Symmetry: C2
Subunit: 296 residues, 2 copies
Amino acid sequence: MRIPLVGKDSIESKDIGFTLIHEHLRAFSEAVRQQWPHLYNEDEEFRNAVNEVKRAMQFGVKTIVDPTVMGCGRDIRFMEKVVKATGINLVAGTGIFIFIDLPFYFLNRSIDEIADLFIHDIKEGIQGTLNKAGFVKIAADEPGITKDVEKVIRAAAIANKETKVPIITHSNAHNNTGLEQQRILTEEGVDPGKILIGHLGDTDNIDYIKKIADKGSFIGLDRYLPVDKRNETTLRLIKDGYSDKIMISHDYCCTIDWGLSITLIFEDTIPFLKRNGVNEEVIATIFKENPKKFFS
Amino acid sequence: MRIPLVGKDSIESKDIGFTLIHEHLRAFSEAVRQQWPHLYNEDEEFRNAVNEVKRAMQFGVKTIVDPTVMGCGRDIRFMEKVVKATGINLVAGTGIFIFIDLPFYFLNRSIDEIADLFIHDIKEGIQGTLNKAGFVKIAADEPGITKDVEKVIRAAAIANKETKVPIITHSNAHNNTGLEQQRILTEEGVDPGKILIGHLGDTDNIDYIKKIADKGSFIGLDRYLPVDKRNETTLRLIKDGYSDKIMISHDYCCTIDWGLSITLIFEDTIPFLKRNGVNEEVIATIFKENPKKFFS
Ligand SMILES: [Co+2]
Ligand SMILES: [Co+2]
Ligand SMILES: [Fe+3]
Ligand SMILES: [Fe+3]
C-alpha cells in the first residue's frame, strides 16, 4: 500500500511493474464540454480508451499514469469505468494545467488554498469518490512563468512536502520553463528526484536536457520533433549514460478535443532502440526502475 | 413568439414587460466545479436564486435576462428548475466569456466554427434541451482586445447577422474595451442598437459613456464605484437626456464562487432617482422600453 489506484486497493511502489508514466485516457476542455456537449461522444471516448489500454496490456504494461487534471477534463468516474473494463493499474493525479491565468474562482485566493485542493484529492479522494490522487501535475509553456503559473508550482511543492507524492510537469522544450519549474520546486524543498520535467523530447538541445537530469530530476522524453530525431536524442541520451533519468511516454490522448497510439513505443521507439544496440536492462530501467524510484 | 424563454413558449418582444437585463442566477468556473465539487452547494445556490427571483417579482419584474455563458457556468437545467419554482420569464444566452485566451479546444479553429456554436444554441437549443438562446454575450477586460477576444467578438457578429439576436458585452470601464467592442461589431455589420456595452457604470468619465451611447448602443449602468457616485452618474446621464440608452442592472450573482441583492435598484437606486426628480416615464423607459427595442 503506497500508490493509490483507481478502482483498486493501493499498491506498493515496488510492485508497479512496467509503467507508462504519462498517457491520457481522454482530454478535453471542461467548459466547452459543459456548454456544447453535442461536440463530444463519451461512448467513442470510452471504446478508444479501453482499446488502447488493452493494447498496452498486450505489450506487457502493468501500470498507466494518467496526468489529466483541471483544465484537461479529469473524470474519475470515466477512469474507473476503464479500469473495470480492462483491469489495468491506473494512477490518477491532481493539479492544475494552465499556461497564463487561473480561472476566476482563484481571484483573491492564496497559494495555500490551491495546495489544499491538491491535498484534498490526495488524502480524501477525487470528485467525491474514495479514489485518491497519487501525484501532482503542473504546466508552463510559451508564456513562461506567469504569476498564476508560479502560484500553481508553489502549491504543488506544498502538496509534495505534506503528502510525499511526486510532481509531473508539462514544459515547453524551446524555452527554459522546465528548468524554471525544477528550480522553483527544489528551492521550495522538493526532492529533485520527485520531479519529472515533461516534454523535453520535443527539443534536440541535448545540453539543456542533460542540465535538468544532472540537477536530479527525471526528463520526459514523452510525446512519442520527428520520432527519428526523438529516437536519436533518446538513443544519444542512453549512449551518454542518462537511462536512469529518462522517462518515455507517448503523451497519447486516446481522445482529444483540440482542432499515433499508446503502443508506438512498442512498434517504433523500443524496436529502433533495440536495433541500435540498446539492451534489455536499459528498457527495464526506463520503464520499471525509474517509475519505481519516482513513486518510492 | 420572438424571444425564447427557459421552460416556456417564446414571447413577443412587446410583451417582455419590466425587465432586468443583466442578472446572474449563479456563476462559477466550469473547470473548478467539475474538479472540486466539494467547494459547491447546488441546493444553497438554488434556494438563493429562487429567493432572489421571487423578490424581484414582488417589485414588478416580469423578465430577467441572465447572461451566464461559457466561462461562467451556464446550466440550462438549473435555470429551468428556477423557472419551474418561480414562473419568471428567463432569457438565456450563448457566448464565451474570456479575457485573454480561449480554451485549448479552439486551437486551430476558425471564427466561423465559434459562431456555429452560438448559432447552434440559438437555433437548435442549449445543452441538449429545446431551450434556445436569445442573445450573445462576450467580454473584454484589462488585457484589452487580444487575438482570441477579437475572434469571439467577430463570431458574435456572425451570429447576430444570421439570427438577429442582440449582443451583450462585459467591458472594463477604465480602458477603451467597450468602445472597441462596439467598433468591431458595427464594422462587421451589427446594428448599434443591437448592442449593450456593459459595465459602463463603473466609471465617472461621462464623456466616454456618452460617446458609446451617441454611437447608437445601449450603455450598461449595471453592477449596482459607490452607488452614490453611480447614482450621480446615472442621474447626470438622465438629466442630460440619455434615458433611452441607459440599461440598469445589478449584475448580481445570487451565488458566485470568486474569492447586495437583485432588488438593490428598488431599495436604493430607483428611490434615489425618484428623490432627485426622476419621474415614472424615465423608469419605464429604462426598464421596459429599452429592453423591448433591444430585443425587437
Ligand atoms: Co503536457
Ligand atoms: Co460582466
Ligand atoms: Fe500530457
Ligand atoms: Fe455579468
